[PDB]
Amino acid sequence: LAVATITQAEQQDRFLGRGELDELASYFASGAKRLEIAQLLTENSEIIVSRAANRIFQKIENMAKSLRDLSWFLRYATYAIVAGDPNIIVVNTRGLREIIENACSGEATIVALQEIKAASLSYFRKDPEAAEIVSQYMDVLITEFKA
Amino acid sequence: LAVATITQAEQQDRFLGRGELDELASYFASGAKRLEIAQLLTENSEIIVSRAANRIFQKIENMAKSLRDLSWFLRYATYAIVAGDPNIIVVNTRGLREIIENACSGEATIVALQEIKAASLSYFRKDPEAAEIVSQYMDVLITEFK
Ligand SMILES: CCC1=C(C)/C(=C/C2=NC(=C\c3[nH]c(/C=C4\NC(=O)[C@H](C)[C@H]4CC)c(C)c3CCC(=O)O)/C(CCC(=O)O)=C2C)NC1=O
Ligand SMILES: CCC1=C(C)/C(=C/C2=NC(=C\c3[nH]c(/C=C4\NC(=O)[C@H](C)[C@H]4CC)c(C)c3CCC(=O)O)/C(CCC(=O)O)=C2C)NC1=O
Numbered sequence: 008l009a010v011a012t013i014t015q016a017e018q019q020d021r022f023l024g025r026g027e028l029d030e031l032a033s034y035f036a037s038g039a040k041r042l043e044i045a046q047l048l049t050e051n052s053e054i055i056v057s058r059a060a061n062r063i064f065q066k067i068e069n070m071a072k073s074l075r076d077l078s079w080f081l082r083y084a085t086y087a088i089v090a091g092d093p094n095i096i097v098v099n100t101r102g103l104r105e106i107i108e109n110a111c112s113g114e115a116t117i118v119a120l121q122e123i124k125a126a127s128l129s130y131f132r133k134d135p136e137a138a139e140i141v142s143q144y145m146d147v148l149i150t151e152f153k154a
Numbered sequence: 155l156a157v158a159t160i161t162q163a164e165q166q167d168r169f170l171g172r173g174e175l176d177e178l179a180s181y182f183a184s185g186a187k188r189l190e191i192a193q194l195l196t197e198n199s200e201i202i203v204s205r206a207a208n209r210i211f212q213k214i215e216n217m218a219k220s221l222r223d224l225s226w227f228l229r230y231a232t233y234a235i236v237a238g239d240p241n242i243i244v245v246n247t248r249g250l251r252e253i254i255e256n257a258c259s260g261e262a263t264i265v266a267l268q269e270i271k272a273a274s275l276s277y278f279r280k281d282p283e284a285a286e287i288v289s290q291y292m293d294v295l296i297t298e299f300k
Contacts, residue, residue: 013233022229023236025196032186039183082167085170
């Protein structure tokens with residue numbers, strides 16, 4: 008964050024670098040777009056989740072938890088997008104591969120997640136900038152289940 | 155702020171509400187303007203600092219330390235502006251007036267700080283919002299010195 012960047016600059020007795028400034032400038036300026044994205048994923052959260060669950064419907068034994076988890080995945084994506092901090096996804100998906108490996112099916116989860124991503128993207132057809140943001144964050148989520 | 159309202163929604167296992175989204179909208183917009191300001195001040199810092207030194211050059215007995223401090227002051231102003239937190243200035247200015255009244259002239263430092271302000275402001279004559287933002291942070295710098 009800003010307070011982060013400032014702390015290290017201070018630590019090194021210096022002005023923020025041109026790069027640090029540009030990076031913060033871009034973080035603030037993409038803010039409106041990131042909020043637009045979150046508002047949209049949120050209001051459509053239920054349709055996005057049910058599309059993902061449906062795609063693996065026949066693989067699911069625990070539908071209540073499946074629907075819950077898929078909603079939670081999308082909710083943390085949504086946090087990360089609002090904060091402009093992909094690490095929110097990383098911290099909160101820590102260890103989930105093992106847990107869901109064991110709980111149901113790793114294969115299926117990735118299938119559902121890919122549908123979370125596709126269904127999410129579907130709301131930004133006209134808006135390449137947003138689609139990129141959405142794909143970047145969704146890819147961070149999925150990758151935490153791949154390698 | 156980013157982490158704060160997200161932390162709450164997180165604790166309550168929910169999506170951010172529309173009211174939360176609008177509040178962040180205001181945060182990011184202001185941050186954008188603050189960052190534009192900080193970039194200008196940073197890129198033109200040598201110029202700003204030299205104007206301020208030059209404005210009191212007759213009183214300066216140590217050009218080096220004077221140029222250093224004025225830069226140090228400007229630096230902390232930019233930190234405050236970037237974070238949007240005037241208290242960065244307050245905290246790092248604490249007790250400084252005494253150290254510097256000793257070292258040279260408290261009063262010349264004030265004149266030079268007014269020139270830091272006046273010089274900083276010259277980059278924002280087309281943008282009265284940004285100008286007011288620079289004036290408000292610089293005033294905290296000058297005041298907490300006095
Ligand atoms: C990133 C945010 C986040 C997620 C997603 C999360 C998931 C998560 N899923 C869990 C269990 C589970 N998850 C599922 C199933 C599924 N899960 C899926 O994402 C699939 C759609 C489906 C497998 C097909 C099942 C069947 C269990 C354990 C069932 C139980 O004993 O109740 C558990 C173990 C504790 C619990 O049962 O609640 C966690 C922590 N925790 C988090 O903080
Ligand atoms: C907000 C960030 C910040 C500032 C500004 C700061 C100033 C500061 N100026 C100092 C000294 C000094 N400062 C100056 C001069 C001046 N100082 C001025 O701001 C005037 C423009 C000019 C007098 C006209 C002089 C001559 C010394 C004594 C250093 C020496 O004797 O070599 C000292 C004493 C220790 C040192 O020499 O490093 C500090 C701590 N410290 C900080 O953490």
